[PDB]
């Protein structure tokens, strides 16, 4: 009857950048989502597979909780089957997704008038990302012209570019935080 | 909240000795603990950030270690002018919260 860490992952300080999405594995708890229901600013509480109202008295198992920071426009890509840059190179959900995708408007917290070049995302990769796997490889992407062996220049590109995250960009460019609960619906461990 | 218990509450050392302080957390904080020093009736200052890295400007004796939920700040070759109350202040989850604070007096 011990609550499980929805506190440690929701009101936390530093969400890690998107190309390395920190992944917390929840187990052996009683997850009360009425703690989230009260917190209103949630820009998009979109649940794919279950409906939020019938979500409390269920009993999940093997529930994960990812987290990252992405542009305000690129928030519409954390969803099953989406196409673009984030879900093809950073974080992709499978076609049979059975969880939820929550979002913030974190312009108060992660935005300095100096260039917040601290968060990054992946720009170039050989192949598309398999579902639910990350790539922290820091090495040059290039067509088979000449292996520059870690030198930036012509036809050699450092993969991880950085966001701007200025507090004057716009509702569509300021950083949005995202938490992706992915249930696995074996004995049920969590409940309400 | 993440309540940080500091032990011991009282201390008794003499100049020229080595002594270590202790501030264990309650939840898992990824080495996001800082250590503060406050003397008698003054603004508390910063000793070491992230529980292991030092602040340019402090003496070369304060140095703490520990990662996870058990942290220790050990001051060696203590000088009598280092008297004061020491505060640990985590930074992982919200709201940020300091410990009760222990006092390091003389004999």
């Amino acid at each position, epitope marked *: 009857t011990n609550l499980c860490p929805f506190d440690e992952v929701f009101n936390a300080t530093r969400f890690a950048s998107v190309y390395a999405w920190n992944r917390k594995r929840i187990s052996n708890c009683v997850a009360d989502y009425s703690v989230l229901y009260n917190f209103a600013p949630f820009f998009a509480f979109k649940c794919y597979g279950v409906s939020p109202t019938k979500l409390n008295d269920l009993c999940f198992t093997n529930v994960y909780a990812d987290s990252f920071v992405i542009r305000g426009n690129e928030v519409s890509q954390i969803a099953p089957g989406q196409t673009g840059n984030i879900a093809d190179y950073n974080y992709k959900l499978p076609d049979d997704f059975t969880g939820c995708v929550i979002a913030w408007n974190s312009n*108060k917290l992660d935005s300095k008038v100096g260039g917040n070049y*601290n968060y990054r995302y992946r720009l170039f990769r050989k192949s598309n990302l398999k579902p639910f796997e990350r790539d922290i490889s820091t090495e040059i992407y290039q067509a088979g012209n000449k292996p520059c062996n870690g030198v930036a220049g012509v036809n050699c590109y450092f993969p991880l570019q950085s966001y701007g995250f200025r507090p004057t960009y716009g509702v569509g460019h300021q950083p949005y935080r995202v938490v992706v609960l992915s249930f696995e619906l074996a004995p049920a461990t969590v409940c309400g | 909240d993440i309540v940080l218990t500091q032990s011991p509450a009282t201390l008794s050392v003499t100049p020229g000795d080595n002594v270590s302080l202790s501030c264990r957390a309650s939840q898992i904080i990824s080495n996001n603990l800082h250590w503060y020093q406050q003397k008698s009736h003054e*603004s*508390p200052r910063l000793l070491i950030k992230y529980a292991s890295q030092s602040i340019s400007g402090i003496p070369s004796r304060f140095s703490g270690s520990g990662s996870g939920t058990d942290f220790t700040l050990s001051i060696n070759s203590v000088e009598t002018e280092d008297f004061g109350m020491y505060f640990c202040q985590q930074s992982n989850t919200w709201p940020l919260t300091c*410990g009760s*604070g222990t006092k390091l007096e003389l004999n």
Partner: nanobody
Amino acid sequence: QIQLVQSGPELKKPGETVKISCKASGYTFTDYGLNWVKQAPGKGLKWMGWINTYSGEPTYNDEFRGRFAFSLETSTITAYLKINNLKNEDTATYFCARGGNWDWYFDVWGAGTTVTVSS
């Protein structure tokens, strides 16, 4: 030169209001936040909740939700703190420390303003 000079000590009656100043100067005010700390005599520090120095929208610690207001003016580079309905319990010394917007460690503090209540 980096400093945050506050207002002098206060003394008010139960029910009155107070405005405490925290005037920052020396560093670019926008590149950091501002945190407030309340220290009752004989106990530990308490984080009162930061305020984004560019916009000014506060974030109250869930204990000091009401009765406190972190107003901010940016013409003159001075933050504020305003308490309504002073009670018999909040006698303490109120700091204001520049905690960053990405690190959150209070390096440069203020001198410390004291607020006591009496009849």
